[PDB]
Amino acid sequence: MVPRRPGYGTMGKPIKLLANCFQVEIPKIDVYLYEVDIKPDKCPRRVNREVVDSMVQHFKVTIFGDRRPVYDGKRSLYTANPLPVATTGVDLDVTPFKVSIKFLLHEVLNPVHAVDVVLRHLPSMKYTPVGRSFFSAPEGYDHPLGGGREVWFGFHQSVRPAMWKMMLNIDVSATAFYKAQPVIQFMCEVLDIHNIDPRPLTDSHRVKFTKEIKGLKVEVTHCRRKYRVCNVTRRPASHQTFPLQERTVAQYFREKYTLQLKYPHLPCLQVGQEQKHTYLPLEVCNIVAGQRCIKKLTDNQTSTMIKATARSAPDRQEEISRLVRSANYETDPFVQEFQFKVRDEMAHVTGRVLPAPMLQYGGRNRTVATPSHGVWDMRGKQFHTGVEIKMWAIACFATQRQCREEILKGFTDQLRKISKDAGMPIQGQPCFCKYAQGADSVEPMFRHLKNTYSGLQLIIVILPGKTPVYAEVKRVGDTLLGMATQCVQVKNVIKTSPQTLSNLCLKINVKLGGINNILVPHQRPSVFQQPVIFLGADVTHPPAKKPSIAAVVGSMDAHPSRYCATVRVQRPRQEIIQDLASMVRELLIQFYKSTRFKPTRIIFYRDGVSGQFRQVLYYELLAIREACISLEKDYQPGITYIVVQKRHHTRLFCADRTERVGRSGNIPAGTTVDTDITHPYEFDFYLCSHAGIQGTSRPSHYHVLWDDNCFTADELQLLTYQLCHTYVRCTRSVSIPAPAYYAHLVAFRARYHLVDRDPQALAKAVQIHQDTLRTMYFA
């Protein structure tokens, strides 16, 4: 099972820190659960909670005595002392239907969640709950995004049984909502028309409008009643008719609610079903307040949201500080019935900052490089093994008007200038260059490109921006012909910022196969005395029918530097990797043909997990094992599987203003916090592997859920840290170890391959040509 903690690390310089985690004391008396059944079940959880609470208030005199309870909004009731109920329950009805209701943690350190509903049922009565977080409309404010879409500021709130006490996480959320507004003004926003008041209804407009409003809710008149939208009518309000004792919706509203439609050419809204024959015009329809955005946001909208949330750790912590005392949790009738005590102060925890390892470079200088706070440069330092390019070609998919002769001449000259100093000589003039336009000129250009040039290594496409050609360029370069790419936008082919080019050298030198740097081997954990292979993993889902994509990368050196890559397609919204076994098989074979050793140690990071450990650890660990028991006998390689979490709501701030680093005032790279806030029994730990430059850092939470290598806590912590510096696209420290960052790009560069028998079209679409399977293409 999940191996317990082998110990706590002590290497590294200690530092005092603060976690948005609050210790909670839970009372000795047992908790009694009272199930509540309501009928029917055709309404939101908020409506359920409202009806039961109003019920309790109306008839509390004898039914409930003098007591204040909490309730999960659904079917779970909590009280402090045994409730005055009879047998299976008492026939009680609140109006609006008839409800019949049918009626540890200390020792371990339902009962864990039972406290959650108590600390959650006061704010859940207040704000708009979104699963685990809440939101409040900004009182006297506006934060629009366009298209009638807003963003509201709220907070995540989850309890966790931290080691030695119950603990409650509070952390700011900033997610998108929909502006309560007239459906007309909303429609005007959606169709990018300010005020059209010719568009009677272009048939495609009639469907593009419902493309977004379909499946929303709406309120009648202008503020009433409330109904659920289902579709836009084909014929307008003056025409669409429903039978009553058969009036059109226009004449009906014209003669029974004495309201003349200003816009009778506009369509109607379906509510309920296409059988209830219930119809509502847009004029008398306001959007309800509190709607959430499930549709995928545009890139620009995502950037605007990012700006809304990227604030520095110092002045942000002082908003969490307010947030905990804002609801005044020790003055809540719900928690004080059950004697709940919290700490309105932050959690003090002393972590340890591991030492990043010095990196070995080559060329003439043989310079060892030491990283400072996550960064190191390369000026006057040559690659460990840089490549020499005899042949290479340019393909500008911007027009001649933007990109011109003398601008490539300058750009290429500058790059050839810096690359030879960087240890990767790009001497000679490019044997080929041609301007191009569109997504469709790509493919035959590239086929002629292979057949006429023998010895042609790399092609650098110069695109203008977000053009459909990128998907083609990648899709072709990988799966059709199997030669190496490196794009660039004209924006950067014009200005030759050296840090831009010197990054381009890093990506390109490894896409041809070279190795930019290695670790000075004597500063490595004990795991490098023996053969060990490292494996990343990610799973990218669609928003929505589009499939999920799964990817794995494999260590191919002992530094470990180079990585091979494979990838598979799978069902929507499914989380587990279906064919991990054979992917590991092919990569173990790749390792056996690169280093000529059978690997004895497998160290295996995984990202993309949501209550999904019970089912993925046990399954994927055997999918690896049978990849091993698939080859020969006496092959029981040691598998240690670690799961990384870039998506919690745990943060850590420095407890000394002198230490608050940078203009974001963020925490340093390489801190480890496996004590106090972490899970007790299970072997997990936090490592803020990166350097926070913008906003406020998210620390990576690594859960070691299996360890056959009996790793001492330091042997594993330092190891994951040294791995985090093995990234090639930049000389910086990333949040997750390089393999976990590689399967992310593979799965991210398979959805460009998707965007264009049935299994073979979508299966071959991802599988790369053999001449580019042995390469670092994803970077």
Added chain:
RNA sequence: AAAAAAAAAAUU
């Protein structure tokens, strides 16, 4: 797509 990091993933 030079780059790491920062952002939610009863009516009609």
